Ligand binder design. Sequence first.
Ligand SMILES: OC[C@H]1O[C@@H](O[C@H]2[C@H](O)[C@@H](O)[C@@H](O)O[C@@H]2CO)[C@H](O)[C@@H](O)[C@@H]1O
Ligand SMILES: [Cl-]
Length: 415
Amino acid sequence: KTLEVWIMPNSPQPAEDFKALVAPFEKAHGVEVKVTVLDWGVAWTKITTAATSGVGPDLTQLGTTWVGAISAMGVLEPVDDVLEALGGEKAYLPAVWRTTRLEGARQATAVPWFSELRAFYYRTDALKAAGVNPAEMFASWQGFEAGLARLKASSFRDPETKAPLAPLCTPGRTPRTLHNAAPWIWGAGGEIVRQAGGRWQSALNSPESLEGLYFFLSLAQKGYVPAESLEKNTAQIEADFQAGKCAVFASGPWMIQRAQVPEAKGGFAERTAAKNLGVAPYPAGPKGRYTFFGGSNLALFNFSKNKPLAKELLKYLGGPEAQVRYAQMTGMLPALRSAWSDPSFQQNPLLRTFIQAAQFGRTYPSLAGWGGVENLAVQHLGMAWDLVAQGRLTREALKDLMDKASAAINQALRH
Ligand SMILES: OC[C@H]1O[C@@H](O[C@H]2[C@H](O)[C@@H](O)[C@@H](O)O[C@@H]2CO)[C@H](O)[C@@H](O)[C@@H]1O
Ligand SMILES: [Cl-]
């Protein structure tokens, strides 16, 4: 007997790590778990095709932001039973619990697997040579921009590249998500969507959201981000940070784990950046401090022929032992709140900064139409980045683009 599991590349050897994670389960149940690894870029298509076609695995990893969308298609097995065996609502951060179902659904359709949230990695050697105190740079928007200005005027050169660093790297080219943009929207007092007595609408074109978006996009128009970096997706920006090409960038806690892994095994431990690595939270904006809080859950397709055995695997993957071990293998945080207390997370100095930054963590609402909203937002945000690359992003042009994005988003939400 066999379970099929789909997962995304959460660890450097995603298939091998997952297999090693489920080995005790395989031994004890006398079952094989076959895993297929999907790139995040193809995962949405593969999972929605399994949903519509009725062909796919027993279990899939689902980004937290996708749970609502796939759940609304009516294809997921209820897992209230698994969540009750794992300790129920009390055992989860309420922000994590809200990702176990479509907003306002009767039944849970996803088991929390891991959490991740966003902060700034920074080069400790570069900030020092620029005369930047990270406690000032990462306090406030004004401290953030003043730090980038000292980084731009720095005479520091990476000891391996023999070249200057860019103050900030952020991806322009593949905006697959709003995750990079959301903290800036939120810190201005904005939102991506807003509910008015029931109905959801875009707030991307609200004065507050436009203020946050303009603040962030204009850092790049001011010369703090190289034009190069707007050519690049997330994976290429990570590589540029690892190769010593920039002083600061936003990512999740997986980069700490990759930094202690040799290059031979998919890490960057021998690079200067890994040996001079700091983490600081997103700076507070004029209306508050927020960061993107997400992660992945696991779900069971209602066409599975092995629902009992698959629920046993969900309970195992959701539980204390597998929660600590998978978070170690990935550099993610446990989804299970109790597991955060494991000394191996609490005593990691860079990871403790992610753990404290979770006080300000913020999630998207769990909407049926979420896939559509994110897809439409990034399409329009992509065009704003195109204006940045040409030095032509004005507040008027940004507003014009988010007015169009909001019409597209509202039309999709009315369905
Ligand atoms: O939007 C899909 C989910 O994204 C998750 O973050 C991913 C990101 O998409 C990848 O590009 C790569 O960087 O890995 C990240 C961590 O898995 C996010 O955690 C989820 O909440 C989203 O649903
Ligand atoms: Cl929002």
